[PDB]
């Protein structure tokens, strides 16, 4: 993904939110962001 | 150490031409070539004996094991 | 011993040596300089010798010249 | 070629330094054929045919889709279809993740549908992203590279730097009659005992005649007979 | 020699004018070492032939090369005509400093006089970069015996 | 060619502090930060030349050039005043970059 | 007749060897030891304690060698020639001054002799210090020997110059099989550390150490040191738009596999894997067992409390490997002369005297507590009157380690054999060519192949021709004529002078700032990355030519590293060259007329800004002319002489530039074996073997360097 | 062309600088949006800064993680240690003239997480000399009683160094 948390500047992880949705959320700060992601690189 | 009595190659006696060479160097100031030319030696052999020679016995006799 | 080892500077030791004995001056064979080969064969040629140090030898056991 | 090459043969080492295999061709052209024997050999062409490896998340599932073009196959000539790429990804690794599922769509994409200390999805996504672009597609794994070359006459002969000698000999385009590799144990594994002494009596003869030093080859035949 | 420095320094000024016609056996830098090495090996073999033909007879180092006492024609061409291209480890000399070999030559210098091609013979005397370039090859040839 | 950027970029920060000093002269409740060299002579100022450079001639007339600094202040920098461990955090607040003063020799 | 410029420039070299000699690398170290470093040793052990009571102390006020009062410095020594016939050693006593107290707080002092220390020939303590020629003949000593050697137990011993790698600096070596390895040898006094930075696969970077168990990836390690945010672990070592980002990002992802989320968990994992667990005060293995390890006890020589620099120094060590993964050319070579340092006779004697003075206080503490415990009264005297029986192993061991050649340091663990070698006296050039010799210590003699070829980086620094023909072919080298091994000066005001010149401190600049120009490294330690480094280098070199005393303190940029280095820690060769100023040379014709006419000698061309010393890696930022008819306006220096590249033994060959180079090497082995005159007192001396000549003669064609020696 | 005079204008107080290493810029329309609520404590003798940031409760809060593992939180504690410096000065300009102010300390704010310590110290069971860097890490958590009232003001500083000439 290579995405950084705007609130704590740490590494975020893709988690499964209560068995059925995909959101990114870290264990660093209480943050979540439900967007779909892309990892395209030349 | 001291000047040799005879030259190595042919055998000309060059041992008698060192004090006269030193007398021609200091007084009657000449270059070594002409002062070594009007002294005897004609060939470049027997000329090498007087030209390229170091005098170590004058530096050895400063360490006399006698009275001093 | 010269072609297999390529010590031609030794060949300059005689020319700058034989022409150094004659006019009473110990010569200089220092690195990247010293006595030039051109004006040491000029000192050697007007003394009555060869410019390149080659003298003709009369042989010892037979008395004739060397070819 | 020197004295480490002779110890490389006398010690009979398992792996050697810089092996080559002298494979030959059939016809003579600068066309398809002499350029299609080459492209069947070298490996890991996935880092030139893909243009990206991206992973997207659609709300319950994941796509690791790969964009395979057709202009790469046009320039360097290989016989592979998108179904052949699906078969190559199906047996890509030996046992890492790759058992369950691959897909083929119209515009040439293969997405790896995945299914499950906590949150081990993104960890598998990172490891599978970092283990994917060094995966072979078409070719043989033990060969480093391949050079086709012209001899003193107008002929065309290739050369690789691998360890097979059977996969190279079983190739559409080469003739399996005459070939020569440096590795003696590679000859012994494929051919046998008697073709391993007739290889060593010319392999010792090759590292000496390129310097001089004729050793009147009955001595070499005596050396090549006490080892085998 | 001046129509051998000019036929290889035109490749150095073409190396930074885009690209060159790279031969398919290697990349763009190993095909520049090979061509410059071939030209600088070709310059020492034809100057070594125009000296031995104009060389006067009844001399020692040519008679000793005509028969097999000691010496070769390479040694007399290296004494008289030109010493050329002291090579080490197969190729030419590497960069002893960053981006260059000697600090007397500029950065990114790939001229023959900067990367190991001497041009003075043993009769005329070597320059100090030529002296160091010959000393490296002589010490590597001397350490392979010890 | 390293002396080209010693004149080309030196006419890029002298115009940058001139856009910061006199353009916003009226009343910004706003701070900056200067770097002065130590062993100061036991004062003078910028003295903008003939549309050229900017160079302080400090008092004790031996002279002390130097303008411009780096863009390290992408991060947020806000100063604050403190009393004797009873009251603090009376911030002013902004940084507008920095300048550095380097003595000529 | 008329003073030229390309011919009188030669006269810079005799005036260089009139003030400072050719054997100065042995003289200056021993002169710096017994004047500066010998006082520095007692300034770390200036007060001893006792387990009987805390009201007992011995205080070392002053230390000196052979000096008590207004008389001359040791009115009668033994002569250096008499102690070579009596099988003695040439030593002077060491006098210390101690404080002697009681519970009645009386304070007085008394001179004592606490041992004998062997004096080197012709250096500030011998009789032979600028002696007249009538003084040399009266004392039966030759006036032409180089000196600088020891005479222990009658026989002559020489401490050889020994090279090693650069201390407190970073070297990178590559490997195709396993992985690229980085090192940084810690130069601490009390311990010998070496922090290795090996990788195995996939960029799984984890540093290792000999005092650490199964190791830790570097993300958690520099997270425990102070770099807490992940945003400045991704930008600090990779940059903005480089291809370095997809390589280091693995160690981020496996930071969450382990003790992430800073030091309530992170430093505990760094401290749990520790060796030598230190059972004294062992309870503190939660937070205070790694704060021991990430400070002055282990890994480095940085004395910080909270770590902005040490967290950066490990992290700027990471970028030098991350650049070396994407590009395998950005490495270092071990055999480069800029990576090596020369250790001289003055440092090994300081190590041995530190060891034998640390042992002297331990063998005397165990003999004074036994006496001050048994009776009931406090013993007034006899605490000073019992040091004669304990000051004998400080003398016998100090001569034994010189006469034997073994320097066994129990705390330091660099036990080397064969340091001192017996002085060769085959001829006059044999005793001089040994005093200018460097012996390199190998690791193993199996697959070496590297430190025996002639490097192009020793042009003028080391002799190109004089190598032995045998087992030590290429492993033994020789210094040239105009070289100079330097010393560390202060290292403190150079750091503050950069802050004057306008560099920002590292605790002020953002962690995301390396896209800009070069970063200042003082002895490997980052200082804070000034803008416009060309002006910084120009101002620093202009301050160097007014007086900053310029033996070693040098500056050089580096573009493929994106850095700029200021070097102050001496122990490194350098050579003096002529500065040119943008069109032509600085040494004019009027400067050379004064040189041979009285005043304005050498060291007056360093103050007036005519010549300067250049280092091996510092002349990589230079461009040097060979002769005076070569002045290109883009040049920086002019060399003095092109034949200084030859050594002292190698300077006997007439016309070396006409021969081939192996015949310039073999002569260096045959010139020392040739027999002839040795000394002026060679008939007045007795030793085990010497060969002489009956009628010696001087050479026909000379050399410009055989009139010097 | 005129000059803008600089004076040191006196030295009686002590200054400090945040230098937030977290929030760069909000690139348009008056950037960097500095907060309001903070009102956090201070410690001398190890200099041990702590500052607090309020949490956005309405958006992206993820209440399950915030009130499942640790306590119901609204604080985000930072941490910084200052070091002494020389030659740095702060400046402000009024209409002709620049006033230098000595700054005397520079520190950096780095978000050391506090609630992980508070959750680890709960879930555990649910020497005169140290010679540097152990006495400095041991003496860190003793007084802390400078729970502070966040204030403002352009009268106690701007009308304090201007009546000096
Ligand atoms: Zn965040
Ligand atoms: Zn005769």
Swiss-Prot record, chain A:
Q: Where are the zinc fingers (C4-type)?
A: 5-29
Location relative to the cell: Nucleus, Nucleolus
Q: Which domain of life is it from?
A: Eukaryota
Q: Which residues bind Zn(2+) 1?
A: 5, 8, 26, 29
Q: What task does this protein carry out?
A: DNA-dependent RNA polymerase catalyzes the transcription of DNA into RNA using the four ribonucleoside triphosphates as substrates. Component of RNA polymerase III which synthesizes small RNAs, such as 5S rRNA and tRNAs. Involved in Pol III transcription reinitiation and RNA cleavage during transcription termination.
| Quaternary structure (record) | Component of the RNA polymerase III (Pol III) complex consisting of 17 subunits.
Family, as annotated: Belongs to the archaeal RpoM/eukaryotic RPA12/RPB9/RPC11 RNA polymerase family.
Give the protein's recorded name: DNA-directed RNA polymerase III subunit RPC10
Lineage, please?
Answer: Eukaryota, Fungi, Dikarya, Ascomycota, Saccharomycotina
Query: What part of the full protein is here?
Result: 1 to 42 of 110
UniProtKB/Swiss-Prot annotation, chain B:
Question: Where does the UniProt annotation locate this protein?
Answer: Nucleus, Nucleolus
Q: Name one GO molecular function term.
A: zinc ion binding
Enumerate the residues binding Zn(2+).
7, 10, 45-46
**Placement of covalent cross-link Glycyl lysine isopeptide (Lys-Gly) (interchain with G-Cter in ubiquitin):** 59
Which InterPro entries does this UniProt record tie to the protein? RNA_pol_su_RPB10, RNA_pol_suN_Zn-BS, RPABC5/Rpb10
GO terms for CC? nucleoplasm; nucleus; RNA polymerase I complex; RNA polymerase II, core complex; RNA polymerase III complex
Miscellaneous notes: Present with 5300 molecules/cell in log phase SD medium.
Assembly, in brief, is:
Component of the RNA polymerase I (Pol I), RNA polymerase II (Pol II) and RNA polymerase III (Pol III) complexes. Component of the RNA polymerase I (Pol I) complex consisting of 14 subunits: RPA135, RPA190, RPC40, RPA14, RPB5, RPO26, RPA43, RPB8, RPA12, RPB10, RPC19, RPC10, RPA49 and RPA34. The complex is composed of a horseshoe-shaped core containing ten subunits (RPA135, RPA190, RPB5, RPO26, RPB8, RPB10, RPC10, RPA12, RPC19 and RPC40) where RPA135 and RPA190 form the DNA-binding cleft.
The protein here is known as DNA-directed RNA polymerases I, II, and III subunit RPABC5
Curated annotation (Swiss-Prot), chain D:
The protein's location, in the record's own words, is: Nucleus
Give the source's domain of life in one word: Eukaryota
Chain segments annotated as coiled-coil in the UniProt record = none
**What is the annotated quaternary arrangement, including any partners?**
Component of the RNA polymerase III (Pol III) complex consisting of 17 subunits.
Any further remark recorded for this protein: Present with 6020 molecules/cell in log phase SD medium.
Tell me the function of this protein. Answer: DNA-dependent RNA polymerase catalyzes the transcription of DNA into RNA using the four ribonucleoside triphosphates as substrates. Largest and catalytic core component of RNA polymerase III which synthesizes small RNAs, such as 5S rRNA and tRNAs. Forms the polymerase active center together with the second largest subunit. A single-stranded DNA template strand of the promoter is positioned within the central active site cleft of Pol III.
Q: Give the record's family classification.
A: Belongs to the RNA polymerase beta' chain family.
Report the protein name in the record.
DNA-directed RNA polymerase III subunit RPC1
Q: Which organism is it from?
A: Saccharomyces cerevisiae (strain ATCC 204508 / S288c)
From Swiss-Prot, chain H:
Q: Where in the cell is it found?
A: Nucleus
BP-aspect Gene Ontology terms:
termination of RNA polymerase III transcription; transcription by RNA polymerase III; transcription initiation at RNA polymerase III promoter; tRNA transcription by RNA polymerase III
**Keywords, sorted A to Z:** DNA-directed RNA polymerase, Nucleus, Phosphoprotein, Transcription
An annotated GO cellular component: nucleus
Q: Where are the transmembrane segments?
A: none
Disulfide cysteine pairs (residue numbers): none
Describe the task this protein carries out: DNA-dependent RNA polymerase catalyzes the transcription of DNA into RNA using the four ribonucleoside triphosphates as substrates. Specific peripheric component of RNA polymerase III which synthesizes small RNAs, such as 5S rRNA and tRNAs. The RPC53/RPC4-RPC37/RPC5 subcomplex is required for terminator recognition and reinitiation.
Q: What else is known?
A: Present with 1590 molecules/cell in log phase SD medium.
**Subunit structure, interactors included:** Component of the RNA polymerase III (Pol III) complex consisting of 17 subunits. Interacts with RPC53/RPC4. RPC53/RPC4, RPC37/RPC5 and RPC11/RPC10 probably form a Pol III subcomplex.
Protein known as: DNA-directed RNA polymerase III subunit RPC5
- What organism is listed for this UniProt entry? Saccharomyces cerevisiae (strain ATCC 204508 / S288c)
Q: What is the lineage of its organism?
A: Eukaryota, Fungi, Dikarya, Ascomycota, Saccharomycotina
Q: Which residues of the full protein are shown?
A: 71 to 262 of 282
């Amino acid at each position: 993904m290579l995405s950084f948390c705007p609130s704590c500047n740490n590494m975020l992880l893709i988690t499964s939110g209560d068995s059925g949705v995909y959101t990114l959320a870290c264990r660093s700060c209480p943050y979540e962001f439900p967007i779909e992601g892309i990892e395209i690189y030349d | 150490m001291i000047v040799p009595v005879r030259c190595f190659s042919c055998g000309k006696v060059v041992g008698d031409k060192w004090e006269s060479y030193l007398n021609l160097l200091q007084e009657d100031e000449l270059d070594e070539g002409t002062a070594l030319s009007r002294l005897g030696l004609k060939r470049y052999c027997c000329r090498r004996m007087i030209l390229t020679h170091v005098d170590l016995i004058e530096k050895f006799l400063r360490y006399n094991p006698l009275e001093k | 011993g010269f072609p297999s080892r390529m010590t031609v500077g030794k060949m300059i030791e005689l020319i700058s040596g034989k022409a150094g004995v004659l006019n009473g001056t110990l010569e200089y064979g220092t690195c990247f300089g010293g006595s030039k080969l051109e004006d040491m064969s000029k000192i050697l040629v007007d003394q009555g010798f060869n410019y390149s140090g080659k003298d003709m030898l009369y042989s010892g056991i037979t008395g004739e010249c060397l070819q | 070629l020197g004295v480490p090459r002779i110890k490389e043969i006398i010690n009979a080492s398992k792996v050697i330094s810089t092996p080559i295999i002298n494979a030959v061709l059939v016809n003579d052209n600068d066309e398809r054929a002499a350029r299609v024997v080459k492209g069947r050999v070298e490996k890991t062409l996935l880092s030139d045919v893909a243009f990206y490896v991206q992973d997207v998340y659609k709300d319950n599932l994941s796509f690791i889709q790969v964009r395979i073009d057709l202009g790469t196959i046009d320039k360097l000539q290989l016989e592979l279809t998108i179904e052949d790429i699906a078969v190559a990804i199906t047996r890509a690794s030996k046992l890492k993740i790759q058992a369950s599922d691959v897909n083929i769509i119209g515009k040439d994409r293969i997405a790896i549908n995945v299914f499950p200390s906590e949150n081990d999805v993104f960890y598998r996504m990172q490891q599978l992203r970092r283990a994917l672009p060094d995966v072979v597609v078409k070719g043989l794994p033990d060969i480093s590279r391949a050079v086709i070359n012209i001899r003193d006459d107008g002929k065309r002969e290739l050369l690789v730097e691998g360890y097979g000698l059977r996969d190279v000999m079983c190739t559409d385009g080469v003739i399996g009659s005459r070939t020569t590799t440096n590795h003696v144990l590679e000859v012994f594994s494929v051919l046998g005992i008697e073709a391993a002494r007739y290889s060593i009596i010319r392999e010792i003869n090759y590292t000496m005649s390129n310097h001089g030093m004729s050793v009147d080859p009955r001595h070499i035949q005596l050396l090549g007979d006490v080892m085998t | 020699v001046e129509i051998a420095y000019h036929k290889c320094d035109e490749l150095i000024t073409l190396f930074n004018k885009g690209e060159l016609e790279t031969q398919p056996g290697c990349n763009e830098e190993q095909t520049l070492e090979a061509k410059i090495g071939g030209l600088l090996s070709k310059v020492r073999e034809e100057v070594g032939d125009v000296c031995i033909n104009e060389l006067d007879n009844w001399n020692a180092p040519l008679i000793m090369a005509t028969c097999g006492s000691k010496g070769s024609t390479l040694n007399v061409s290296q004494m008289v005509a030109v010493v050329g291209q002291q090579i080490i480890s197969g190729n030419r000399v590497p960069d002893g400093f960053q981006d260059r070999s000697l600090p007397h030559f500029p950065k990114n210098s790939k001229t023959p006089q900067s990367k190991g091609f001497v041009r003075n013979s043993f009769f005329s005397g070597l320059s100090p970069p030529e002296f160091l370039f010959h000393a490296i090859s002589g010490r590597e040839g001397l350490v392979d015996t010890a | 060619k390293e002396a080209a950027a010693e004149l080309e970029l030196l006419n890029a920060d002298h115009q940058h502090i001139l856009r910061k000093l006199k353009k916003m002269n009226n009343k910004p409740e706003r701070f900056m930060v200067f770097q002065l060299p130590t062993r100061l002579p036991a004062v003078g100022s910028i003295r903008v030349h003939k549309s050229g450079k900017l160079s302080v001639k400090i008092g004790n007339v031996v002279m002390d050039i130097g303008k411009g600094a780096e863009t390290t202040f992408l991060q947020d920098v806000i100063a604050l005043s403190i009393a004797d461990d009873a009251s603090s955090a009376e911030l002013l607040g902004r940084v507008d970059g920095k300048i550095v003063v380097t003595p000529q020799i | 007749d008329e003073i030229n410029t390309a011919q009188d420039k030669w006269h810079l070299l005799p005036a260089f060897l009139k003030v400072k000699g050719l054997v100065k690398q042995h003289l200056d170290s021993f002169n710096y030891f017994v004047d500066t470093d010998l006082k520095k040793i007692i300034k770390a052990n200036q007060l001893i304690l006792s387990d009987v009571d805390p009201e007992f102390y011995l205080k070392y006020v002053d230390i000196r060698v052979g000096k008590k009062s207004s008389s001359s410095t040791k009115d009668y020594l033994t002569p250096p020639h008499e102690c070579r016939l009596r099988d003695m050693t040439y030593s002077a006593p060491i006098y210390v001054d101690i404080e002697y107290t009681r519970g009645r707080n009386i304070i007085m002092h008394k001179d004592v002799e606490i041992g004998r220390m062997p004096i080197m020939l012709r250096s500030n303590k011998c009789i032979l210090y600028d002696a007249d020629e009538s003084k040399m003949a009266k004392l039966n000593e030759c006036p032409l020997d180089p000196g600088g050697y020891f005479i222990v137990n009658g026989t002559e011993k020489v401490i050889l110059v020994q090279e090693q790698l650069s201390k407190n600096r970073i070297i990178v070596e590559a490997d195709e099989k396993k992985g690229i390895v980085q090192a940084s040898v810690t130069s601490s006094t009390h311990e010998r550390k070496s922090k290795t930075y090996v990788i195995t696969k996939n960029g799984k970077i984890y540093l290792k150490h000999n005092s650490i168990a199964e190791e830790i990836p570097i993300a958690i390690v520099l997270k425990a040191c102070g770099i807490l945010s992940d945003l400045e672990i991704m930008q600090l070592v990779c940059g903005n738009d480089s291809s370095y980002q997809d390589i280091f990002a693995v160690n981020l992802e496996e930071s969450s596999k382990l003790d992430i989320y800073t030091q309530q968990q992170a430093l505990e994992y760094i401290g749990a894997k520790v060796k030598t667990m230190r059972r004294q005060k062992l309870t503190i293995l939660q937070e205070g067992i790694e704060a021991i390890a990430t400070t002055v006890i282990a890994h480095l020589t940085v004395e910080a409390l909270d770590f902005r620099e040490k967290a950066l120094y490990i992290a700027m060590m990471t970028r030098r490997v991350v650049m070396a993964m994407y590009n395998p050319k950005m490495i270092d070579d071990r055999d480069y002369v800029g990576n090596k340092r020369l250790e001289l006779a003055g440092q090994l004697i300081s190590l041995l005297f530190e060891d034998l003075f640390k042992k002297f206080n331990n063998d005397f503490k165990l003999s004074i507590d036994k006496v001050l415990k048994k009776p009931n009264r406090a013993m007034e005297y006899d605490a000073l009157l019992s040091i004669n029986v304990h000051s004998n192993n400080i003398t016998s061991g100090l001569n034994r380690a010189i006469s034997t050649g073994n320097w066994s340091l129990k705390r330091f663990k660099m036990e080397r054999a064969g340091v001192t070698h017996v002085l060769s006296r085959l001829s006059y050039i044999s005793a001089l060519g040994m005093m200018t010799r460097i012996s390199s210590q190998f690791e193993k003699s199996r697959k070496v192949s590297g430190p025996r070829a002639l490097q192009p980086s020793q042009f003028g620094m080391l002799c190109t021709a004089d190598t032995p023909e045998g087992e030590a072919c290429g492993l033994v080298k020789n210094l040239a004529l105009m070289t100079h091994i330097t010393t560390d000066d202060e290292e403190e005001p150079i750091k503050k002078l950069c802050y004057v010149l306008g560099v920002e401190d590292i605790t002020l600049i953002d962690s995301a700032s390396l896209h800009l120009n070069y970063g200042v490294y003082l002895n490997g330690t980052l200082i804070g990355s000034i803008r416009f480094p060309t002006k910084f280098v120009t101002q620093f070199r202009h301050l160097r030519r007014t007086g900053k005393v310029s033996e070693f303190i040098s500056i050089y940029s580096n573009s493929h590293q994106m850095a700029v280095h200021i070097a102050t820690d001496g122990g490194r060769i350098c050579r003096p060259l002529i500065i040119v100023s943008d069109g032509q040379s600085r040494v004019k014709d009027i400067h050379l007329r004064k040189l041979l006419d009285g005043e304005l000698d050498f060291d007056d061309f360093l103050k007036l800004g005519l010549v300067e010393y250049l280092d091996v890696n510092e002349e990589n930022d230079s461009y040097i002319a060979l002769y005076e008819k070569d002045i290109v306006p883009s040049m920086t220096h002019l060399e003095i002489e092109p034949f200084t590249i030859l050594g002292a033994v190698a300077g006997l060959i007439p016309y070396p530039h006409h021969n081939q180079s192996p015949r310039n090497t073999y002569q260096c082995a045959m010139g020392k074996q040739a027999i002839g005159a040795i000394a002026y007192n060679q008939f007045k001396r007795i030793d085990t073997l010497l060969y002489l000549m009956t009628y010696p003669q001087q050479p026909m064609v000379k050399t410009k360097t055989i009139e010097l020696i | 062309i005129e000059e803008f005079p600089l004076k040191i204008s006196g030295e009686e107080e002590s200054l400090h600088v945040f230098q937030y290493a977290n929030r760069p810029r909000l690139v348009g329309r008056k950037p960097a949006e500095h907060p309001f609520i903070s009102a956090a404590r201070y410690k001398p003798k190890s200099h041990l800064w702590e500052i607090d940031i309020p949490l956005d409760e309405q958006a992206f809060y993820n209440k399950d993680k915030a009130e499942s593992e640790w306590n119901g939180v609204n604080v985000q504690t930072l941490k910084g240690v200052g070091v002494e410096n020389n030659g740095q000065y702060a400046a402000f300009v009024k209409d002709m003239q620049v006033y230098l102010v000595p700054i005397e300390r520079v520190a950096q704010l780095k978000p050391f997480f506090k609630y992980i310590d508070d959750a680890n110290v709960t879930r555990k069971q649910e020497q005169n000399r140290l010679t540097g860097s152990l006495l400095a890490h041991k003496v860190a958590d003793e007084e802390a009683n400078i729970e502070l009232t966040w204030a403002e003001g352009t009268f106690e500083q701007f009308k304090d160094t201007i009546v000096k000439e």
